[PDB]
Each structure stands twice: as structure tokens, then as C-alpha cells.
A paper describes a structure:
Here, using a pseudotype virus entry assay, we found that NeoCoV and its close relative, [name]-2180, can efficiently bind to and use specific bat [name] 2 ([name]) orthologues and, less favourably, human [name] as entry receptors through their receptor-binding domains (RBDs) on the spike (S) proteins. We determined the cryo-electron microscopy (cryo-EM) structures of the [name]-2180 spike trimer as well as of the NeoCoV and [name]-2180 RBDs bound to [name] [name], revealing a binding mode that is distinct from that observed for SARS-[name]-2 and NL63. Cryo-electron microscopy analysis revealed an [name]–[name] binding interface involving protein–glycan interactions, distinct from those of other known [name]-using coronaviruses. Our structural analysis indicates that NeoCoV and [name]-2180 bind to an apical side surface of [name], which is largely different from the surface engaged by other [name]-using coronaviruses.
To determine the molecular basis of [name] recognition, we performed structural studies of Bat37ACE2 in a complex with the NeoCoV and [name]-2180 RBDs. 3D classification revealed that the NeoCoV [name]–Bat37ACE2 complex primarily adopts a dimeric state with two copies of [name] bound to two RBDs, whereas only a monomeric state was observed in the [name]-2180–Bat37ACE2 complex. We determined the structures of these two complexes at a resolution of 3.8 Å, and C2 symmetry expansion was performed for the NeoCoV [name]–Bat37ACE2 complex to further improve the resolution to 3.5 Å, enabling a reliable analysis of the interactions involved in binding. Despite existing in different oligomeric states, the structures revealed that both NeoCoV and [name]-2180 recognize Bat37ACE2 in a very similar manner. The [name]-2180 RBM contains a T510F substitution relative to NeoCoV, which further improves hydrophobic interactions with Bat37ACE2 and is consistent with the increased binding affinity observed for this NeoCoV point mutant. The [name]-2180 spike equivalent residue is Phe511, which is consistent with its slightly higher affinity for hACE2. Using biolayer interferometry (BLI), we found that the NeoCoV and [name]-2180 RBDs bound with the highest avidity to [name] ([name]) [name] (apparent binding affinity (KD,app) = 1.98 nM for NeoCoV and KD,app = 1.29 nM for [name]-2180), whereas hACE2 binding was below the detection limit. Although Bat37ACE2 is not the best receptor for supporting pseudotype entry, probably due to its moderate association rate (kon) with the RBDs of the two viruses, the observed dissociation rate (koff) is very slow, rendering it ideal for virus neutralization and cryo-EM analysis.
Numbering used by the authors:
A (entry chain A): 21 to 615
B (entry chain B): 387 to 413, 416 to 428, 431 to 480, 483 to 584
Write the structure that this text describes.
């Protein structure tokens, strides 16, 4: 009778959890759209009510052991609740870990770097990021990059070192080998037949993807190097790695700001629809209404009346201050909202659809039990939104919406510029994500001595992404922690996963749509078969293993890079013609070793 | 034509301004009874005489010093959420002596902000049209300090704020009378 009692328990939990979730989500939404000292405390108190509830219910959940229960639906919901987390640690260790997390976050957020050649000038991180994405001055770029690492990396290293040990002890308390293993568990699923995925299997598939994407990256790297070598003459070897501070990114994650240096065809113009929208007198209302039609044309869900009346879709003129950053909200009780400050710009024409795509997924699994109201994997949540975003960006859609001339067509030079711009955001970001996630995993696992944490980080970076730091760090430095998602407790594999899933989903939906052509020309709208198939997967949430949810679209059990390589197939061929024998890089090169 | 109500005790606010249409009646005296400070398409001397299809006058309390943005070309809050004067059918600023029953009791206010829906659309006044009731109701329930409050009317969320001009109290006060004359031929029912 354990399962029967567990079922009654979960139904009671889910009912109260929804009511408390609504109060907290609403208080948070109201605060973000109305910043007042009166709303501030209000939101927290609402959050605490849910938290106190969740922990009391956690203790109750542990009265229903998973070994005795046979129904997988019940086991999954209880498994979510039956987690001690930090409550495996003593009061001193629990409080100490919380203190360290707050401290590391603060050091990053309030960090600044001052100009070594003029003490009068100093910039906060926001100003330093602005320099990295814009400046072409080798010197300015160098002192801001170096300074950031010295100013925060040397304050966080000690905190992160103690943070690691404490996170590992916590994970042991929760029956994991280490904290890396704890995070790997987010991909672990229990089930029968072939629908079973292990924590160690995650590592193996990740290595496999890296090797499959690797040759596309090697072609992109040689091309980018060949062009940056002229932009920064005598600073980069014909064969070798790229300087970290010249990647257009403070942390070397994205290469998108290099597009202007690495553009395939300089004489060609890109497509910018902003001018058309202004001439046609578009509003924010037009952008969102068209976003709804896009999804109706795909064959998914309409928006509710509450969505249109309550969401904050544009910045107010009232005088109240608001938070501007695109977020999809789910307040419970079928209350779905999008928060953003929409302008009549081509970028927002893609963002509105992206956020709308998050809502489409959130609505789809609304029929699931409270605890299972999530994506099959965090990678699915984001990957689905991105696939829909690409479908909208595709010129065929823009023509359909009346945003392009009927006499407009693309040549094979335009396609190359488009694909490379995409590659700088999609391909150049992958071996980075892989490298950094793997390094931390080894740190938490305990495969690297503390004194060697830094040395392994840069050796991996030279071999995996081909990026080098111009001035050596003795060891006291902790460069990884200079990034938001390392100083704070965040995982990066989801981003590696998000990208691969995006392409697996895009390709699968294209064949259903019967698109006889390249994936960068393929759209998903006006194919209700593709819409229905996508509906079926989105609806599942966490009631099924992500391997099941993946199979429902891509007919596979695991991650697969082939769809990505397919998308960029014509780019790959062009890059070969440009790169010749320069493909790949020498990991033995470093600016410091030049003299 | 009976104009008693134009200089009567119950001076209105703009948010709830008053108007009276005159027809089939005989209308200089109105200008003699009050003290005029200024005159602003039709020449006021041409307005003062002749036969009209209809004559419609609206009036409300309003500081003389604020006349700068009551005029056409203004995009002030005093135009869009307050009073949008129509100009399709071709404005006297005056003060009223305490010797004339002009009680001017209560508080005199106006709407500064009023919008709704997910796009924060401004519920602006049509020419010759009062502020929307949703705007009026939100303003009545506003703190009067200018803080914007949330209201919900018919299920539709609104944002509204109110301010006053009840500090501008002189014995003569400050009032504005706007006379619009419809000169359409074939009617001519309002004559001197
Ligand atoms: C941005 O965030 C702020 C902070 O929360 C919001 O401010 C609140 O707005 C609500 C209205 O939405 C206010 O509620 C009303 O309070 C009136 C009483 O005001 C006096 O007393 C309060 C203390 O309780 C003082 O703070 C205030 O200064 C006054 O001295 C009530 O009379 C109102 O009653 C109405 O609603 C009830 C509903 O049950 C009906 O029964 C009544 O008949 C009547 O219709 C109402 O309760 C609230 O007091 C404001 N808080 C503060 C601190 O001032 C902003 O509205 C929000 N802005 C936006 C755009 O979201
Ligand atoms: C959370 O921690 C408690 C201990 O504070 C765990 O309960 C113990 O489990 C062991 C192993 O089965 C038993 O020998 C002890 O007698 C239990 N103690 C109590 C007070 O029940 C609990 O299992 C942990 N829960 C999870 C999900 O890790
Ligand atoms: C790449 O070059 C383009 C110009 O072709 C830059 O676009 C300009 O950006 C500024 C803002 O800094 C705008 O004020 C201009 O109006 C833009 N010009 C055009 C024609 O749109 C673009 O910013 C450059 N990329 C980078 C990373 O610097
Ligand atoms: C883009 O397409 C054009 C047109 O097909 C290609 O240019 C042709 O290349 C062949 C092979 O050398 C020549 O015989 C033709 O005379 C060329 N036509 C013109 C108008 O120049 C071009 O090479 C293609 N570019 C890429 C990168 O594939
Ligand atoms: C598991 O529980 C669900 C209700 O949450 C029920 O519909 C399903 O039939 C049960 N499965 C088995 C095998 O009992
Ligand atoms: C979908 O079909 C409609 C006609 O019903 C057409 O107007 C629209 O442009 C098509 N969508 C695309 C992306 O071509
Ligand atoms: C108002 O009162 C003053 C002072 O007695 C007087 O001079 C003026 O003529 C009066 N104006 C009107 C319109 O009655
Ligand atoms: C807003 O919601 C109400 C129901 O409360 C509905 O009648 C109205 O049509 C909706 N308005 C819009 C613009 O969606």
C-alpha cells in the first residue's frame, strides 16, 4: 500500500505547490514590471513560503521508498522530492558554503579593471565587456583582458577551492561520487528496453560529439586565424593558436564579433528588414501577432486572452522602472506571459518568436503533474525555442510575411556569409563549452591536484579550442572563475546539449515537412504534420526519459552531431577551399614564447 | 439662450468638464459679466454675432499660466489625457469675481497617465471627447501624489495617475471657456 499512499501524498503536494508557485511567480513578475521598495520584500516572503513548504514535503516524501514503489510516474515525482541537498552538511559547513557562494558571486559582479597606463580611467565589468566586443586596439584589449583575470581570478581561486571540497562532500551525502557526478545525474534516466541512460554514458557521448564537430571547427579556426592574422599583423602565426584577448569575447566563448574581420564576401550586404518594418509602419503589436500566426501556421498553440492583456510586451511610458531582458513566464493556473521591451527591429522580430516558442512548450506540458512540469532535459527547452527561431529567420518566411521584395533572391555568396555568421555563434562555441565543462568535472572528481588546476585548464584550451594567453600565470590565478557561470553554481553542458539537439530537431522536422534542400533554407511553418509531431514530444515534459522524447522527433536514442555538420555542409566545403593545408592549429605556439 | 450655468457656483474640473449646446434661441453680456484676460480660427468678433446652426460651449477650471500648452500643437498630458479641443468647426481666458456665486468647492485635478493592455497603449482622448471612464475611475482612486497605480476594469488591466492644481486659488480664480460655432447653412437657429 506504499505506492497508494505515495500517490495521495503527491496529489496533495502538487495541488499546494501550484498555489504557492502562483503566489511567488506573481510577486516576482509584479516586481520586475514595477520596481518599488514595497514589492521587493513582498516577492521574497512569497518565495520563502514555497521553500518552507518544499522542505517539509521533502521529509514527507522520504516516507515512500522508491524500491517498494513500482509505478515509474510515482517514483519520478518522489525522486525529485527525496533529495537532501545541502541538508547533509553540518550547520557550519552549510552556512560556510552559502557564504562562499555569495562572496564569489559578489566578486564577479562588482569587479572592475583600471587602466595601468592612466589610473584616472577605470571601467566596471559592463564597460570592459563593451571594450571587448568593439575595440580593435591590440593594446587596449590586452590590458582589459589581463586585468579582469588578475582583479577577480585571484580573489575567487581560494573560495572556489574550498567551494569544490564542500560541494563534493554534499554530493557524497546525496549518494553521488562527487559534485560532477551530481550534475551528470541531470541526464540520467531510468526505464526499460533501450530507454536507459547512465551518468558515465553522458561523458562518452560528449566526447563522441566533440570529435564529430571537431573537423568543422578546425576549418573555421584556420579561416578565422588567416583573417585575424592580417587584422593583427605579426601578432598571430600562420599556423598556431589564437590570442585569447582577440576573440571578441572576454571569456572566449563566442566569435560573433569577428564577423566584420572574417566576413567571407566583403562586397556583399546582409539582410536587414528593420528598414522595411519602418516603411510599413510596424508596431510591437504587429511583431507579436505575427509570432502567434507563425506558430498557428506550424500547427501548435494559440495564445490566451490573459496573455495579451497582462504580459509586459513593451517598455511603459508611465514613469515606473522595469527590468528589460526577454523572459518567458509561467505563473501557474494556466497563466502564461512574456516579459520584454519590444522595439520595431529585425532582432526583436526573431526574439518575440523565440520567447513565444518557450510559451508553446510551457503550455504543452501544462497537463503534467506539478513536479514533472519541465522539459525532458534543459537542453530540450532551449533547443526547441532555437529551432523555431531559425525557421523565422529563414528568408522564405520573411518573404511570406511581406518583409522582402518579391524580386529578391539569394546567391551562393550570401549563403556563405549567413552560414559563417551562424558558425561563429554555433560552431566556435561548442569546443569551448566542452573544454570548460570537462575541466571542472575533473576538478570536482579529484583527478587534478589543486596546484595543477590552472595548468590543466590552459593545456586543455590549447589542444581543444586552440586559444592562448599572452602572459603566463604562476598558479595563484583561477581564470575559469572570472566567468559568471563558474563563480556561480551553473552547468555548461546544457549549452553543448542545446546546440546539438537544436539541429537534430530541425532536421527531423524538415523531412516531415518534405523540404528537398539545405537546412538553412528549410522552414517549419505551413507543415501541420511537423507541427503535430512536435506537439507530441513537447507534451511529455519529464513523464518520460529524454531519450524517449528525443526518439519521438529524431528517431534516435542519443545525441548526434551529424545534423549540425549537414546544416554547415556548404560552409565546410567553402572553408576547405580557403584553408588548404592550414586546417587545425599548433598547440606549441604562444605569444610569450616569441622572444 | 440661457448661459447662467456658465458662471454658476459649481465650477467643474477638466476630468469631468461640462458643456451645453444651444439651439433655437437668442444669444456681449457674457463677456461683460466676467473679466477677460485673453482671446484666442474664427475672429471672436465674428463669433460674437450672426446666425449659427448650433452653438456649443464647454468650460472648466484651468490656471492662466498653463495656457501655453492648452493650444494646438501641444502634446502635453493636459491635451492627450485631459482635454483634446476640436478644431473642425470654427477660446476665452477669464477670471470670475467673488461677487458672482462661484463656490469653487472641492478639489480640482487632472489625469497625467492612463494606459492599458500588454502593449501599454495610451487611452488618449478623441477631439471633443472626455477622458475614458476607466481613466476617470482609476484617477478617482489614485493617491493624488502622482504615483502610478494598477487598476482592472472589465478584466482589462490599466495604469493610472492623478495630480492637482488646487493650489492655484485666487479670489478671481482662473477659468477657460471654449465656444465652438457650427455655421452650416440651412439651419441658422442660434441668432443674437
Ligand atoms: C506598484 O507597486 C505599488 C506597491 O505595492 C502599488 O501600490 C499599491 O496599489 C494598491 C492598488 O492597486 C493600493 O491598494 C489600495 O489602498 C487604498 C488605501 O490607501 C491608503 O491606505 C494604505 C494602507 O493600506 C496606504 O498605503 C495609502 O497611502 C493610503 O493611505 C484602498 O482604499 C484601496 O481600496 C480599493 O480596493 C479594494 C479591494 O478590496 C476595494 O474593496 C475598495 O473599495 C477600493 O476599490 C486599495 O486597497 C495599495 O495601498 C498601494 N500600496 C502602497 C504602499 O501605496 C502600485 O499600485 C503598483 N503600480 C502598478 C502600476 O502596478
Ligand atoms: C536525508 O538524511 C537522513 C539523515 O538525516 C537520511 O535518513 C537516514 O538514512 C539511513 C540510511 O538508510 C538510516 O540508517 C538512518 O536511520 C536514517 N535516519 C533517519 C532520521 O531517518 C535520509 O535517508 C536522507 N534522504 C535522502 C533523500 O538522502
Ligand atoms: C560591423 O560593421 C557594421 C557596419 O557595416 C557595424 O554596424 C554599425 O553599428 C553602429 C553602432 O556601434 C550603428 O550606429 C551603425 O548605424 C551601424 N551601421 C549600419 C550600416 O548598420 C557593426 O556594429 C560592426 N560590428 C562590430 C562587432 O563592430
Ligand atoms: C557561385 O556561383 C557562380 C556561378 O555558378 C560560380 O562561378 C562560376 O564558376 C565556374 C567554374 O569555375 C565558371 O566556369 C563560371 O564561368 C563562373 N561563373 C561566373 C559568373 O563567374 C562561383 O564559383 C560560385 N562560388 C562558390 C564559392 O561556389
Ligand atoms: C501509474 O499512475 C498513473 C496515474 O498517475 C496511472 O494512470 C497509470 O495507469 C499507473 N500505471 C501503472 C502500471 O499502475
Ligand atoms: C503559408 O501559406 C500562406 C497561404 O495560406 C502564405 O501566404 C504564406 O506566405 C506561407 N508561408 C510561408 C513561410 O511561405
Ligand atoms: C471685479 O471687482 C473689481 C473690484 O471691485 C472691479 O473693479 C471689477 O470691475 C469687477 N469685475 C467684474 C467683471 O465684475
Ligand atoms: C482580455 O481578457 C478579457 C477576459 O477577462 C477578454 O474578454 C478580452 O477580450 C481580452 N482582451 C484582449 C486584447 O485579449
Amino acid at each position: 500500500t506504499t505506492e497508494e499512499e505515495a500517490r495521495d501524498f503527491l496529489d496533495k503536494f502538487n495541488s499546494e505547490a501550484e498555489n504557492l508557485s502562483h503566489e511567488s511567480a506573481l510577486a516576482s513578475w509584479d516586481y520586475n514590471t514595477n520596481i518599488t521598495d514595497e514589492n521587493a520584500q513582498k516577492m521574497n516572503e512569497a518565495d520563502s513560503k514555497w521553500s518552507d513548504f518544499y522542505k517539509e514535503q521533502s521529509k514527507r516524501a522520504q516516507a515512500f521508498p522508491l524500491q517498494e514503489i513500482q509505478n515509474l510516474t510515482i517514483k519520478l515525482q518522489l525522486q525529485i522530492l527525496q533529495q537532501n541537498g545541502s541538508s547533509v552538511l553540518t550547520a557550519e559547513k552549510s552556512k560556510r558554503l552559502s557564504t562562499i557562494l555569495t562572496t564569489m558571486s559578489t566578486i564577479y559582479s562588482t569587479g572592475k579593471v583600471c587602466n595601468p597606463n592612466n589610473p584616472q580611467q577605470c571601467f566596471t565589468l559592463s564597460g570592459l565587456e563593451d571594450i571587448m566586443e568593439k575595440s580593435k586596439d591590440y593594446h587596449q584589449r590586452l590590458w582589459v583582458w589581463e586585468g579582469w583575470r588578475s582583479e577577480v581570478g585571484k580573489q575567487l581561486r581560494p573560495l572556489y577551492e574550498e567551494y569544490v571540497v564542500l560541494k563534493n562532500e554534499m554530493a557524497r551525502g546525496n549518494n553521488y561520487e562527487d559534485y560532477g557526478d551530481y550534475w551528470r545525474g541531470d541526464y540520467e534516466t531510468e526505464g526499460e528496453d533501450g530507454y536507459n541512460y547512465s551518468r558515465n554514458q553522458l561523458m562518452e557521448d560528449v566526447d563522441r560529439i566533440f570529435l564529430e564537430i571537431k573537423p568543422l571547427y578546425e576549418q573555421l579556426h584556420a579561416y578565422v586565424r588567416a583573417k585575424l592574422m592580417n587584422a593583427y599583423p605579426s601578432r598571430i602565426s600562420p599556423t598556431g593558436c589564437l590570442p585569447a584577448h582577440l576573440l571578441g569575447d572576454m571569456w572566449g566563448r563566442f566569435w560573433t564579433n569577428l564577423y566584420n574581420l572574417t566576413v567571407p564576401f566583403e562586397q556583399k550586404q546582409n539582410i536587414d528588414v528593420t528598414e522595411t518594418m519602418k516603411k510599413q509602419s510596424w508596431d510591437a503589436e504587429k511583431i507579436f501577432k505575427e509570432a502567434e500566426k507563425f506558430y498557428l501556421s506550424v500547427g501548435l498553440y494559440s495564445m490566451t486572452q490573459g496573455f495579451w492583456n497582462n504580459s509586459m510586451l513593451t517598455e511603459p511610458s508611465d514613469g515606473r522602472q522595469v527590468v528589460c531582458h526577454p523572459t518567458a513566464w509561467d505563473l501557474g493556473e494556466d497563466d502564461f506571459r512574456i516579459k520584454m521591451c519590444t522595439k520595431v527591429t529585425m532582432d526583436d522580430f526573431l526574439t518575440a518568436h523565440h520567447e513565444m516558442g518557450h510559451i508553446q512548450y510551457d503550455m504543452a506540458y501544462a497537463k503534467q503533474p506539478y513536479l514533472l512540469r519541465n522539459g525532458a532535459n534543459e537542453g530540450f527547452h532551449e533547443a526547441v525555442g532555437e529551432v523555431m527561431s531559425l525557421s523565422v529567420a529563414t528568408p522564405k518566411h520573411l518573404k511570406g510575411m511581406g518583409l522582402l521584395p518579391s524580386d529578391f533572391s539569394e546567391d551562393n555568396e550570401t549563403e556563405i556569409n549567413f552560414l559563417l555568421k551562424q558558425a561563429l555563434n554555433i560552431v566556435g562555441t561548442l569546443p569551448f563549452t566542452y573544454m570548460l565543462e570537462k575541466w571542472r568535472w575533473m576538478v570536482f572528481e579529484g583527478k587534478i591536484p589543486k596546484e595543477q588546476w590552472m595548468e590543466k585548464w590552459w593545456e586543455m584550451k590549447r589542444e581543444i579550442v586552440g586559444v592562448v594567453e599572452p602572459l603566463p600565470h604562476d598558479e595563484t590565478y583561477c581564470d575559469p572563475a572570472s566567468l559568471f557561470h563558474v563563480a556561480n553554481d551553473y552547468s555548461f553542458i546544457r549549452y553543448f546539449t542545446r546546440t546539438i539537439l537544436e539541429f537534430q530537431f530541425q532536421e527531423a522536422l524538415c523531412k516531415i515537412a518534405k523540404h528537398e534542400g539545405p537546412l538553412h533554407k528549410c522552414d517549419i511553418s505551413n507543415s501541420t504534420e511537423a507541427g503535430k509531431k512536435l506537439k507530441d514530444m513537447l507534451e511529455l515534459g519529464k513523464s518520460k526519459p529524454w531519450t524517449y522524447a528525443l526518439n519521438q522527433i529524431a528517431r534516435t536514442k542519443e545525441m548526434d552531431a551529424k545534423p549540425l555538420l549537414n546544416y554547415f555542409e556548404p560552409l565546410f566545403s567553402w572553408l576547405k577551399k580557403q584553408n588548404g593545408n592550414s586546417v587545425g592549429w599548433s598547440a606549441d605556439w604562444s605569444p610569450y614564447s616569441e622572444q | 439662450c440661457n448661459f447662467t450655468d456658465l458662471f454658476r457656483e459649481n465650477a467643474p474640473t477638466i476630468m469631468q468638464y461640462k458643456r451645453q449646446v444651444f439651439t433655437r434661441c437668442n444669444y456681449t453680456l457674457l463677456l461683460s459679466l466676467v473679466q477677460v484676460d485673453e482671446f484666442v480660427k474664427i475672429t471672436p468678433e465674428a463669433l460674437a454675432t450672426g446666425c449659427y446652426s448650433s452653438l456649443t460651449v464647454d468650460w472648466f477650471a484651468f490656471p492662466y499660466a498653463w495656457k501655453s500648452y492648452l493650444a494646438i500643437g501641444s502634446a502635453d498630458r493636459i491635451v492627450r489625457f485631459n482635454y483634446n479641443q476640436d478644431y473642425s468647426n470654427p477660446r476665452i481666458h477669464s477670471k470670475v469675481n467673488s461677487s458672482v456665486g462661484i463656490s469653487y468647492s472641492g478639489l480640482y485635478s487632472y489625469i497625467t497617465n492612463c494606459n492599458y493592455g500588454g502593449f501599454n497603449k495610451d487611452d488618449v482622448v478623441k477631439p471633443g471627447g472626455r477622458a475614458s471612464q476607466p481613466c476617470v475611475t482609476g484617477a478617482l482612486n489614485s493617491p493624488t501624489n502622482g504615483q502610478v497605480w494598477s487598476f482592472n476594469f472589465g478584466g482589462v488591466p490599466y495604469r493610472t495617475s492623478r495630480l492637482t492644481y488646487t493650489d492655484h486659488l485666487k479670489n478671481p480664480l482662473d477659468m477657460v471657456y471654449v465656444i465652438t460655432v457650427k455655421y452650416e447653412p440651412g439651419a441658422e437657429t442660434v441668432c443674437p
